[PDB]
Amino acid sequence: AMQNRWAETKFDSDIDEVVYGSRLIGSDPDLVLGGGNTSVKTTERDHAGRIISVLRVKNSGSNLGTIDSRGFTGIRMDDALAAAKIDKMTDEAMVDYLKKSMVNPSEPSPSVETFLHAFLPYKFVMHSHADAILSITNTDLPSDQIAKILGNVVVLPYIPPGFTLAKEVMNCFKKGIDGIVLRKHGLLTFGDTGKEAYDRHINIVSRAENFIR
C-alpha cells in the first residue's frame, strides 16, 4: 500500500524544500519508473540586482530521486507567464523560449514540461508519470467516474506532452482542487507548501492503486 513519507517541517530555503519533496517522489518506483518533475516559485535577485519571481524547475542534470539544488534551473516567471498569450509552440520553439527565459544560461536545460509548472498558480507543483495513474486512465472508465474514485480532481483527456497540454492545464485549473489527472500521461498536484503538494500526490495515486489492486 503506497505510504506517505513526509517527515520534515523546517527548511532553510525554498530550494531545500523542493529538493526534499523531489527526493521523496523519486524514491517511490510506483511514482517514478526516469521522468517526472517538480518546481517551486521563489524570490531571487537577478544579475542586474532586480528582485524577481523565479520558477526553479527540475533540470536535465539529475533524476528526481537524488536531486540537489543544482538540479533546479531558474526561469523568469515574467517570461514564462508571457507565453500564455502564445497560441501554439512547437517543442523546439518551446525549448528555445525557455533557454531565453533562464536566469542563468549556464545552468542545465530546464524540464521540457516547465510550462505545466509555470502556468499553475501555486508555489509548489509536482508532476509524475505514476504507474497506477497510467493504469486507471488507460481503462475505459469515463473521466467523471475516474474523478469520483480519485477525489477533488479535474481529469483531462490524453494530450501529447508539450505546449498545448500546458495551455489546457492552465485553463482547467480551478480554485480548491487537489490535483489534475492527465490521462495516459500522469498527475499534477500543487499547493502552498511542499508537503501540501506531496500529500495530495500520495492520496490520489494511492486511491488509484487501491482501486486497481
Ligand SMILES: [Cl-]
Ligand atoms: Cl455522488
Ligand SMILES: [Zn+2]
Ligand atoms: Zn509528463
